[PDB]
């Protein structure tokens, strides 16, 4: 596809402007048109793993629906940095559904750890990924250590290609039941942390469901689905990481990469 080849050249040019790596897939789900850069390389996924985590919780809830209303009475000792919802409600507890919304929409780290514990540990999230056909994703640690993003470390990584297939199946396809898919979409449509990333690179009439991640080594990621009016959804997977341990994570590379693919796909 000629638009795809041109977009790939532009993504190479974009990567050449910084000392790091860009991992990218955009997939038009109707045609299968697929723009990719470093699609089969591993990247540290950081908080984008919270999407897989919450899909696993939703899957469990299909086998007990009241699970989402279960109150978790967590402790001050559970609280770790970057927990803007759980810190506010400690002493009152939160439901499992509220913890999912907090981890997806505010990237709440304590909420993620409480959900990992509910499921039985990080290995259960990896097992869930395997059950939906993702042989690549691996969740090795909990928050906040999963954000170390060390060069060459394969812990807490996936590939852009694997994550594109998983996002496709979860939000657009049938990996989840219809009610669970709708809830995951509704939560990700309401994300608060992504305004400068994928959301900033698409036309004004496209809706976006996304989950960001930010970590050490200037790591800045965003994954999700855009819903253009009168056309099929488009999956966007953007992973970036830097060689300098002192790098500042950026938003603008993700927005630029998104714009490249948006131009290609219309």
XYZ file of N, CA and C in Angstrom:
798
model
N 0.872 -1.182 0.000
C 0.000 0.000 0.000
C 0.913 1.238 0.000
N 0.705 2.126 -0.959
C 1.575 3.282 -1.146
C 1.475 4.299 -0.011
N 0.278 4.519 0.519
C 0.163 5.414 1.678
C 0.910 4.843 2.878
N 0.887 3.518 3.093
C 1.572 2.874 4.191
C 3.088 3.054 4.011
N 3.648 2.844 2.821
C 5.095 2.950 2.640
C 5.572 4.362 2.923
N 4.794 5.363 2.475
C 5.148 6.761 2.723
C 5.118 7.083 4.225
N 4.090 6.616 4.915
C 4.003 6.809 6.346
C 5.191 6.188 7.094
N 5.584 4.979 6.678
C 6.727 4.316 7.311
C 8.022 5.116 7.128
N 8.243 5.688 5.965
C 9.394 6.554 5.742
C 9.361 7.761 6.687
N 8.183 8.362 6.835
C 8.076 9.500 7.734
C 8.316 9.124 9.193
N 7.900 7.923 9.605
C 8.185 7.481 10.982
C 9.683 7.273 11.213
N 10.396 6.782 10.204
C 11.852 6.672 10.280
C 12.471 8.050 10.446
N 11.999 9.011 9.656
C 12.501 10.387 9.788
C 12.236 10.934 11.165
N 11.042 10.701 11.729
C 10.720 11.170 13.068
C 11.688 10.588 14.110
N 11.949 9.274 14.013
C 12.850 8.630 14.970
C 14.248 9.258 14.907
N 14.663 9.708 13.739
C 16.005 10.232 13.546
C 16.197 11.546 14.312
N 15.127 12.139 14.824
C 15.265 13.417 15.531
C 15.579 13.213 17.005
N 15.625 12.018 17.556
C 15.994 11.823 18.957
C 16.798 10.587 19.170
N 17.487 10.472 20.302
C 18.388 9.378 20.589
C 17.621 8.304 21.348
N 16.821 7.551 20.644
C 15.989 6.503 21.226
C 15.309 5.713 20.121
N 14.262 5.023 20.524
C 13.552 4.101 19.631
C 12.061 4.474 19.647
N 11.462 4.363 18.465
C 10.020 4.479 18.247
C 9.493 3.138 17.799
N 8.470 2.625 18.488
C 7.772 1.422 18.150
C 6.344 1.815 17.822
N 5.854 1.487 16.623
C 4.586 2.023 16.183
C 3.824 0.989 15.347
N 2.545 0.878 15.589
C 1.624 0.202 14.652
C 0.342 1.023 14.593
N -0.139 1.283 13.376
C -1.509 1.785 13.159
C -2.172 0.762 12.238
N -3.390 0.359 12.577
C -4.099 -0.707 11.846
C -5.492 -0.223 11.550
N -5.861 -0.123 10.265
C -7.259 0.150 9.860
C -7.989 -1.172 9.935
N -8.901 -1.332 10.877
C -9.464 -2.642 11.130
C -10.375 -3.151 10.045
N -10.882 -2.304 9.156
C -11.689 -2.815 8.044
C -10.850 -3.455 6.942
N -9.754 -2.795 6.564
C -8.978 -3.225 5.408
C -7.766 -4.045 5.805
N -7.368 -3.948 7.081
C -6.124 -4.516 7.510
C -4.912 -3.702 7.126
N -5.089 -2.501 6.566
C -3.936 -1.618 6.253
C -3.141 -1.427 7.542
N -1.826 -1.607 7.442
C -0.980 -1.696 8.636
C 0.314 -0.947 8.472
N 0.463 0.144 9.211
C 1.667 0.982 9.250
C 2.495 0.545 10.442
N 3.736 0.147 10.267
C 4.526 -0.353 11.387
C 5.970 0.153 11.314
N 6.554 0.390 12.484
C 7.939 0.703 12.673
C 8.443 -0.038 13.903
N 9.482 -0.864 13.760
C 10.007 -1.692 14.839
C 8.917 -2.534 15.474
N 8.043 -3.095 14.610
C 6.879 -3.818 15.106
C 7.166 -5.047 15.909
N 8.281 -5.702 15.662
C 8.603 -6.968 16.354
C 9.694 -6.805 17.414
N 10.041 -5.575 17.772
C 10.999 -5.298 18.856
C 10.271 -5.109 20.171
N 10.925 -5.558 21.250
C 10.348 -5.350 22.576
C 10.592 -3.945 23.099
N 9.568 -3.407 23.780
C 9.575 -2.112 24.427
C 9.003 -2.245 25.821
N 9.480 -1.435 26.764
C 8.853 -1.414 28.114
C 7.507 -0.768 28.046
N 6.481 -1.482 28.479
C 5.099 -1.001 28.250
C 4.625 -0.003 29.318
N 5.287 0.067 30.479
C 4.878 0.941 31.568
C 3.382 0.814 31.825
N 2.692 1.911 32.104
C 1.292 1.886 32.498
C 0.332 1.430 31.384
N 0.785 1.245 30.144
C -0.137 0.703 29.157
C -0.607 -0.723 29.506
N 0.177 -1.452 30.334
C -0.237 -2.741 30.847
C -1.518 -2.706 31.681
N -1.896 -1.531 32.186
C -3.127 -1.448 32.978
C -4.335 -1.808 32.117
N -4.256 -1.659 30.805
C -5.364 -2.120 29.937
C -5.529 -3.618 30.018
N -4.416 -4.378 29.902
C -4.462 -5.850 29.982
C -4.950 -6.311 31.357
N -4.479 -5.631 32.401
C -4.902 -5.898 33.768
C -6.409 -5.770 33.927
N -6.984 -4.662 33.459
C -8.402 -4.461 33.626
C -9.239 -5.389 32.739
N -8.739 -5.730 31.557
C -9.411 -6.745 30.755
C -9.461 -8.068 31.515
N -8.384 -8.468 32.180
C -8.379 -9.675 32.980
C -9.401 -9.637 34.120
N -9.510 -8.506 34.793
C -10.532 -8.318 35.852
C -11.921 -8.442 35.259
N -12.186 -7.782 34.123
C -13.486 -7.882 33.463
C -13.801 -9.313 33.067
N -12.821 -10.045 32.545
C -13.003 -11.433 32.206
C -13.434 -12.234 33.440
N -12.770 -12.035 34.570
C -13.145 -12.738 35.795
C -14.557 -12.393 36.196
N -14.962 -11.150 36.010
C -16.282 -10.677 36.408
C -17.381 -11.305 35.544
N -17.091 -11.769 34.347
C -18.121 -12.373 33.522
C -18.554 -13.662 34.261
N -17.702 -14.251 35.116
C -17.879 -15.480 35.851
C -18.275 -15.298 37.298
N -18.489 -14.026 37.644
C -19.148 -13.469 38.816
C -19.408 -11.972 38.758
N -20.500 -11.429 38.218
C -20.732 -9.997 37.974
C -20.658 -8.978 39.105
N -21.209 -9.343 40.262
C -21.033 -8.716 41.546
C -19.567 -8.517 41.931
N -18.585 -9.156 41.319
C -17.183 -8.869 41.549
C -16.925 -7.376 41.397
N -17.532 -6.741 40.385
C -17.230 -5.320 40.167
C -17.704 -4.418 41.288
N -18.717 -4.878 42.061
C -19.241 -4.100 43.188
C -18.564 -4.439 44.504
N -17.654 -5.413 44.509
C -16.969 -5.792 45.744
C -16.136 -4.605 46.250
N -16.256 -4.263 47.523
C -15.496 -3.189 48.145
C -14.171 -3.746 48.629
N -13.112 -3.057 48.273
C -11.761 -3.310 48.724
C -11.388 -2.261 49.762
N -11.214 -2.647 51.016
C -10.859 -1.770 52.140
C -9.347 -1.839 52.336
N -8.646 -1.103 51.496
C -7.194 -1.053 51.469
C -6.688 -0.096 52.531
N -5.388 -0.151 52.776
C -4.753 0.518 53.899
C -3.842 1.621 53.439
N -3.501 2.546 54.356
C -2.552 3.590 54.051
C -1.229 2.988 53.589
N -0.777 1.869 54.156
C 0.427 1.133 53.842
C 0.421 0.592 52.422
N -0.680 0.417 51.739
C -0.741 0.052 50.337
C -0.369 1.190 49.382
N -0.416 2.441 49.869
C -0.328 3.607 49.004
C 1.107 3.797 48.540
N 1.241 3.951 47.224
C 2.479 4.312 46.585
C 2.296 5.533 45.708
N 3.379 6.077 45.176
C 3.306 7.340 44.422
C 2.412 7.192 43.205
N 1.923 8.312 42.705
C 1.149 8.379 41.510
C -0.180 7.618 41.699
N -0.904 7.928 42.775
C -2.149 7.278 43.170
C -3.219 8.307 43.534
N -3.625 9.130 42.560
C -4.479 10.296 42.862
C -5.891 9.990 43.299
N -6.410 8.792 42.997
C -7.746 8.415 43.441
C -7.724 7.625 44.736
N -6.878 6.571 44.791
C -6.828 5.768 45.996
C -6.390 6.553 47.211
N -5.496 7.497 47.054
C -5.087 8.319 48.214
C -6.234 9.108 48.757
N -7.152 9.541 47.914
C -8.289 10.374 48.310
C -9.349 9.563 49.059
N -9.459 8.268 48.775
C -10.544 7.448 49.310
C -10.089 6.420 50.329
N -8.835 6.449 50.734
C -8.341 5.511 51.754
C -9.129 5.777 53.021
N -9.571 4.726 53.680
C -10.392 4.765 54.886
C -11.830 4.430 54.547
N -12.247 4.723 53.333
C -13.599 4.427 52.853
C -13.595 3.212 51.968
N -12.429 2.880 51.394
C -12.370 1.788 50.431
C -12.887 2.244 49.062
N -12.755 1.343 48.078
C -13.263 1.566 46.736
C -13.777 0.231 46.184
N -14.787 0.278 45.308
C -15.180 -0.943 44.634
C -14.158 -1.361 43.593
N -14.229 -2.638 43.173
C -13.360 -3.105 42.077
C -13.580 -2.290 40.813
N -14.813 -1.954 40.445
C -15.079 -1.111 39.265
C -14.442 0.268 39.417
N -14.517 0.868 40.594
C -13.895 2.164 40.848
C -12.380 2.076 40.733
N -11.775 0.989 41.197
C -10.327 0.778 41.054
C -9.923 0.653 39.606
N -10.710 -0.072 38.794
C -10.452 -0.154 37.367
C -10.509 1.219 36.704
N -11.571 1.972 37.007
C -11.698 3.326 36.403
C -10.525 4.203 36.853
N -10.085 4.112 38.102
C -8.983 4.928 38.572
C -7.677 4.564 37.872
N -7.428 3.255 37.726
C -6.157 2.876 37.110
C -6.136 3.203 35.646
N -7.278 3.090 34.939
C -7.336 3.408 33.514
C -7.397 4.906 33.231
N -8.137 5.681 34.000
C -8.391 7.083 33.660
C -7.435 8.064 34.315
N -6.832 7.680 35.446
C -5.894 8.516 36.169
C -4.533 7.826 36.328
N -4.341 6.647 35.794
C -3.129 5.848 35.898
C -2.718 5.578 37.348
N -3.725 5.366 38.215
C -3.471 5.160 39.656
C -2.693 3.889 39.913
N -1.484 4.028 40.511
C -0.584 2.887 40.694
C -1.019 1.967 41.828
N -1.511 2.496 42.938
C -1.997 1.662 44.040
C -3.179 0.847 43.545
N -4.083 1.475 42.783
C -5.228 0.756 42.238
C -4.780 -0.440 41.405
N -3.756 -0.236 40.576
C -3.235 -1.353 39.764
C -2.725 -2.468 40.665
N -1.941 -2.140 41.705
C -1.422 -3.191 42.579
C -2.531 -3.920 43.300
N -3.594 -3.234 43.702
C -4.704 -3.906 44.367
C -5.386 -4.884 43.429
N -5.544 -4.509 42.145
C -6.144 -5.365 41.144
C -5.246 -6.544 40.804
N -3.928 -6.332 40.696
C -2.987 -7.428 40.461
C -3.149 -8.431 41.602
N -3.199 -7.947 42.844
C -3.344 -8.843 43.987
C -4.643 -9.585 43.953
N -5.740 -8.938 43.548
C -7.048 -9.573 43.454
C -6.997 -10.752 42.515
N -6.246 -10.600 41.398
C -6.169 -11.622 40.391
C -5.256 -12.772 40.804
N -4.314 -12.543 41.735
C -3.383 -13.569 42.146
C -1.917 -13.296 41.855
N -1.570 -12.136 41.305
C -0.200 -11.785 40.991
C -0.020 -11.443 39.525
N 1.140 -10.871 39.171
C 1.402 -10.431 37.777
C 1.312 -11.574 36.773
N 1.668 -12.796 37.206
C 1.613 -13.964 36.329
C 0.205 -14.205 35.825
N -0.827 -13.792 36.544
C -2.192 -14.016 36.091
C -2.528 -13.101 34.937
N -1.936 -11.901 34.907
C -2.133 -10.976 33.758
C -1.443 -11.535 32.522
N -0.234 -12.074 32.712
C 0.433 -12.731 31.555
C -0.379 -13.904 31.032
N -0.912 -14.720 31.964
C -1.736 -15.861 31.562
C -2.976 -15.417 30.818
N -3.588 -14.315 31.217
C -4.748 -13.773 30.528
C -4.354 -13.371 29.132
N -3.207 -12.672 28.963
C -2.732 -12.325 27.632
C -2.591 -13.580 26.778
N -2.004 -14.652 27.297
C -1.886 -15.884 26.521
C -3.248 -16.425 26.086
N -4.222 -16.340 26.985
C -5.556 -16.867 26.663
C -6.267 -16.131 25.532
N -5.894 -14.889 25.295
C -6.466 -14.132 24.170
C -5.554 -14.105 22.959
N -4.519 -14.938 22.949
C -3.686 -15.132 21.777
C -2.409 -14.354 21.726
N -2.066 -13.665 22.810
C -0.879 -12.826 22.909
C 0.213 -13.601 23.589
N 1.181 -14.111 22.836
C 2.298 -14.945 23.295
C 3.502 -14.103 23.677
N 3.410 -12.784 23.577
C 4.530 -11.884 23.680
C 4.545 -11.054 24.958
N 3.373 -10.498 25.330
C 3.246 -9.734 26.540
C 3.815 -10.481 27.755
N 4.556 -9.808 28.613
C 4.966 -10.396 29.878
C 4.993 -9.339 30.993
N 4.192 -9.592 32.038
C 4.164 -8.755 33.230
C 4.921 -9.509 34.328
N 6.061 -8.997 34.690
C 6.970 -9.597 35.633
C 6.901 -8.969 37.005
N 6.648 -7.675 37.105
C 6.706 -6.944 38.352
C 5.423 -6.182 38.592
N 5.318 -5.578 39.788
C 4.214 -4.706 40.158
C 4.661 -3.252 40.110
N 3.723 -2.353 40.449
C 4.079 -0.939 40.507
C 4.845 -0.626 41.773
N 5.816 0.291 41.731
C 6.232 1.053 40.548
C 7.405 0.454 39.768
N 7.943 -0.691 40.164
C 9.170 -1.236 39.576
C 8.980 -1.606 38.113
N 7.754 -1.837 37.669
C 7.596 -2.225 36.260
C 7.952 -1.082 35.310
N 8.172 0.131 35.787
C 8.531 1.332 35.037
C 10.009 1.607 34.942
N 10.894 0.725 35.322
C 12.329 0.986 35.235
C 12.855 1.149 33.826
N 12.304 0.457 32.844
C 12.590 0.710 31.415
C 14.059 0.624 31.107
N 14.779 -0.346 31.702
C 16.220 -0.455 31.543
C 16.604 -0.957 30.168
N 17.658 -0.397 29.552
C 18.024 -0.870 28.195
C 18.314 -2.348 28.173
N 17.726 -3.053 27.214
C 17.881 -4.484 27.027
C 17.155 -5.386 28.005
N 16.414 -4.824 28.942
C 15.687 -5.647 29.918
C 14.367 -6.088 29.319
N 14.091 -7.389 29.231
C 12.857 -7.847 28.651
C 11.735 -7.985 29.666
N 11.999 -7.789 30.955
C 10.887 -7.775 31.915
C 9.868 -6.687 31.575
N 8.598 -6.924 31.731
C 7.554 -5.924 31.562
C 7.614 -5.252 30.203
N 7.663 -6.094 29.183
C 7.720 -5.665 27.804
C 6.661 -6.362 26.942
N 6.419 -5.766 25.787
C 5.711 -6.377 24.667
C 6.256 -5.821 23.387
N 5.750 -6.261 22.262
C 6.076 -5.668 20.958
C 4.918 -4.846 20.467
N 5.184 -3.832 19.628
C 4.041 -3.069 19.063
C 3.053 -3.964 18.301
N 3.551 -4.923 17.545
C 2.715 -5.836 16.782
C 1.805 -6.656 17.699
N 2.363 -7.200 18.791
C 1.551 -8.002 19.685
C 0.474 -7.147 20.351
N 0.855 -5.936 20.759
C -0.105 -5.080 21.441
C -1.180 -4.606 20.461
N -0.846 -4.363 19.205
C -1.870 -3.992 18.222
C -2.919 -5.108 18.082
N -2.478 -6.345 18.001
C -3.404 -7.485 17.888
C -4.272 -7.557 19.148
N -3.688 -7.385 20.328
C -4.462 -7.471 21.576
C -5.469 -6.346 21.720
N -5.058 -5.102 21.407
C -6.001 -3.965 21.447
C -7.140 -4.200 20.461
N -6.798 -4.638 19.250
C -7.833 -4.990 18.247
C -8.828 -5.963 18.827
N -8.334 -7.068 19.366
C -9.259 -8.111 19.863
C -10.084 -7.642 21.050
N -9.514 -6.841 21.933
C -10.162 -6.428 23.164
C -11.228 -5.354 22.961
N -10.887 -4.303 22.200
C -11.791 -3.181 22.081
C -12.708 -3.269 20.881
N -12.300 -3.980 19.837
C -13.057 -4.032 18.575
C -13.574 -5.434 18.298
N -12.770 -6.463 18.475
C -13.120 -7.838 18.294
C -13.753 -8.471 19.509
N -13.621 -9.803 19.568
C -14.429 -10.590 20.510
C -13.594 -11.297 21.566
N -12.462 -10.752 21.962
C -11.732 -11.366 23.061
C -12.535 -11.362 24.367
N -13.277 -10.283 24.624
C -14.165 -10.145 25.764
C -15.611 -10.335 25.314
N -16.495 -10.667 26.243
C -17.928 -10.609 25.994
C -18.381 -9.193 25.693
N -19.551 -9.056 25.093
C -20.021 -7.737 24.675
C -20.132 -6.752 25.815
N -20.628 -7.167 26.991
C -20.774 -6.230 28.098
C -19.437 -5.766 28.637
N -18.486 -6.721 28.675
C -17.127 -6.424 29.181
C -16.363 -5.527 28.211
N -16.462 -5.783 26.915
C -15.871 -4.937 25.881
C -16.403 -3.527 26.002
N -17.719 -3.356 26.169
C -18.310 -2.047 26.276
C -17.813 -1.289 27.502
N -17.658 -2.017 28.628
C -17.151 -1.371 29.844
C -15.698 -0.940 29.681
N -14.859 -1.784 29.056
C -13.463 -1.403 28.851
C -13.348 -0.170 27.948
N -14.135 -0.184 26.866
C -14.195 0.985 25.988
C -14.658 2.244 26.711
N -15.747 2.134 27.499
C -16.268 3.279 28.188
C -15.209 3.885 29.141
N -14.487 3.024 29.869
C -13.465 3.500 30.757
C -12.348 4.221 29.977
N -11.879 3.623 28.897
C -10.740 4.176 28.119
C -11.132 5.408 27.322
N -12.386 5.540 26.874
C -12.889 6.748 26.264
C -12.809 7.924 27.223
N -12.986 7.628 28.534
C -12.920 8.642 29.544
C -11.599 8.909 30.197
N -10.503 8.449 29.596
C -9.162 8.671 30.112
C -8.876 10.164 30.251
N -8.197 10.547 31.313
C -7.843 11.927 31.643
C -6.392 12.265 31.288
N -5.528 11.276 31.055
C -4.087 11.491 31.002
C -3.494 11.631 29.603
N -4.293 11.514 28.564
C -3.837 11.403 27.211
C -4.012 12.568 26.282
N -4.367 13.755 26.761
C -4.762 14.833 25.873
C -3.651 15.295 24.929
N -2.395 15.111 25.306
C -1.273 15.595 24.497
C -0.659 14.505 23.612
N -1.213 13.299 23.596
C -0.615 12.132 22.953
C -1.465 11.723 21.749
N -1.995 10.510 21.651
C -2.808 10.153 20.473
C -3.907 11.147 20.209
N -4.609 11.603 21.265
C -5.723 12.534 21.127
C -5.306 13.808 20.395
N -4.065 14.215 20.516
C -3.601 15.459 19.921
C -3.244 15.283 18.453
N -3.165 14.067 17.955
C -2.739 13.804 16.575
C -3.824 13.386 15.614
N -5.059 13.253 16.058
C -6.179 12.824 15.208
C -7.084 13.984 14.860
N -7.853 13.873 13.765
C -8.876 14.898 13.458
C -9.842 15.104 14.579
N -10.456 16.298 14.584
C -11.374 16.704 15.638
C -12.624 15.869 15.770
N -13.033 15.191 14.679
C -14.265 14.404 14.705
C -13.983 12.932 15.060
N -12.789 12.537 15.393
C -12.519 11.150 15.786
C -12.608 11.013 17.311
N -13.303 9.996 17.816
C -13.262 9.688 19.249
C -12.092 8.779 19.518
N -11.507 8.846 20.709
C -10.341 8.045 21.086
C -10.565 7.372 22.430
N -10.285 6.074 22.460
C -10.157 5.291 23.700
C -8.673 5.002 23.852
N -8.001 5.431 24.937
C -6.559 5.202 25.041
C -6.126 4.980 26.474
N -4.933 4.415 26.600
C -4.216 4.279 27.869
C -2.746 4.680 27.628
N -2.303 5.660 28.430
C -0.908 6.139 28.380
C 0.015 5.311 29.246
N 1.333 5.454 29.034
C 2.313 5.007 30.003
C 3.518 5.948 29.960
N 4.134 6.163 31.104
C 5.317 6.995 31.227
C 6.258 6.331 32.217
N 7.523 6.229 31.912
C 8.480 5.593 32.793
C 9.831 6.171 32.690
N 10.800 5.494 33.308
C 12.205 5.918 33.346
C 12.784 5.914 31.940
N 13.998 6.428 31.771
C 14.628 6.483 30.460
C 13.756 7.213 29.447
N 13.056 8.259 29.897
C 12.248 9.044 28.981
C 11.194 8.236 28.234
N 10.644 7.215 28.844
C 9.706 6.330 28.179
C 8.352 6.989 28.135
N 7.751 7.083 26.959
C 6.430 7.705 26.766
C 5.679 6.878 25.766
N 4.544 6.329 26.184
C 3.737 5.403 25.395
C 2.285 5.826 25.373
N 1.538 5.340 24.364
C 0.045 5.506 24.336
C -0.484 4.417 23.401
N -1.531 3.723 23.845
C -2.166 2.687 23.031
C -3.659 2.912 23.053
N -4.350 2.537 21.968
C -5.804 2.648 21.972
C -6.393 2.535 20.580
N -7.615 3.002 20.484
C -8.431 2.909 19.272
C -9.064 4.257 18.995
N -8.998 4.689 17.748
C -9.736 5.817 17.256
C -10.955 5.358 16.481
N -12.061 6.095 16.674
C -13.358 5.799 16.096
C -13.735 6.954 15.184
N -13.379 6.906 13.901
C -13.801 7.949 12.991
C -15.236 7.798 12.611
N -15.942 8.871 12.314
C -17.381 8.705 11.979
C -17.531 7.945 10.705
N -18.377 6.998 10.461
C -18.669 6.240 9.258
C -17.519 5.410 8.727
N -16.583 5.068 9.584
C -15.605 4.095 9.159
C -15.240 3.247 10.347
N -14.626 2.121 9.985
C -14.219 1.164 11.011
C -13.168 1.739 11.947
N -13.030 1.204 13.133
C -11.995 1.699 14.077
C -10.568 1.521 13.529
N -9.690 2.378 14.040
C -8.259 2.344 13.717
C -7.491 2.152 15.022
N -6.696 1.111 15.114
C -5.853 0.829 16.296
C -4.568 1.658 16.178
N -4.173 2.301 17.268
C -2.903 3.054 17.361
C -2.081 2.527 18.530
N -0.855 2.131 18.259
C 0.096 1.636 19.277
C 1.361 2.461 19.153
N 1.730 3.192 20.196
C 2.920 4.035 20.165
C 3.758 3.807 21.422
N 4.966 3.276 21.252
C 5.945 3.075 22.306
C 7.166 3.903 21.954
N 7.690 4.672 22.916
C 8.966 5.369 22.729
C 9.807 5.252 23.990
N 11.123 5.116 23.778
C 12.047 5.038 24.924
C 13.368 5.626 24.481
N 14.154 6.135 25.435
C 15.360 6.906 25.163
C 16.593 6.196 25.761
N 17.766 6.534 25.216
C 19.014 5.971 25.709
C 19.512 6.672 26.958
N 19.238 7.967 27.107
C 19.734 8.725 28.276
C 18.919 8.399 29.502
N 19.505 7.934 30.625
C 18.720 7.709 31.839
C 18.089 9.003 32.339
N 18.653 10.153 31.965
C 18.161 11.462 32.425
C 17.211 12.108 31.427
N 16.747 11.338 30.443
C 15.802 11.878 29.450
C 14.474 12.276 30.074
N 13.882 13.354 29.572
C 12.556 13.832 29.984
C 11.532 13.216 29.054
N 10.532 12.547 29.566
C 9.501 11.980 28.728
C 8.715 13.135 28.108
N 8.393 12.856 26.852
C 7.734 13.809 25.959
C 6.367 13.302 25.485
N 5.540 14.205 25.091
C 4.279 13.902 24.459
C 4.293 14.076 22.931
N 5.156 14.962 22.448
C 5.038 15.441 21.071
C 5.445 14.366 20.062
N 6.340 13.447 20.373
C 6.684 12.396 19.430
C 5.475 11.512 19.180
N 4.738 11.172 20.243
C 3.551 10.343 20.090
C 2.510 11.062 19.214
N 2.297 12.355 19.497
C 1.319 13.115 18.687
C 1.751 13.174 17.231
N 3.034 13.354 16.978
C 3.555 13.441 15.606
C 3.404 12.125 14.857
N 3.709 11.003 15.531
C 3.599 9.696 14.924
C 2.150 9.412 14.559
N 1.255 9.755 15.485
C -0.192 9.632 15.268
C -0.648 10.417 14.030
N -0.198 11.665 13.935
C -0.565 12.499 12.777
C -0.097 11.884 11.465
N 1.105 11.319 11.414
C 1.616 10.652 10.210
C 0.639 9.589 9.731
N 0.191 8.735 10.684
C -0.727 7.646 10.316
C -2.134 8.163 10.001
N -2.612 9.164 10.736
C -3.908 9.778 10.422
C -3.931 10.338 9.012
N -2.873 10.963 8.555
C -2.806 11.447 7.162
C -2.858 10.296 6.168
N -2.168 9.226 6.503
C -2.172 8.083 5.600
C -3.559 7.490 5.463
N -4.318 7.481 6.540
C -5.570 6.717 6.593
C -6.740 7.640 6.363
N -6.417 8.866 5.914
C -7.442 9.685 5.285
C -6.842 11.000 4.814
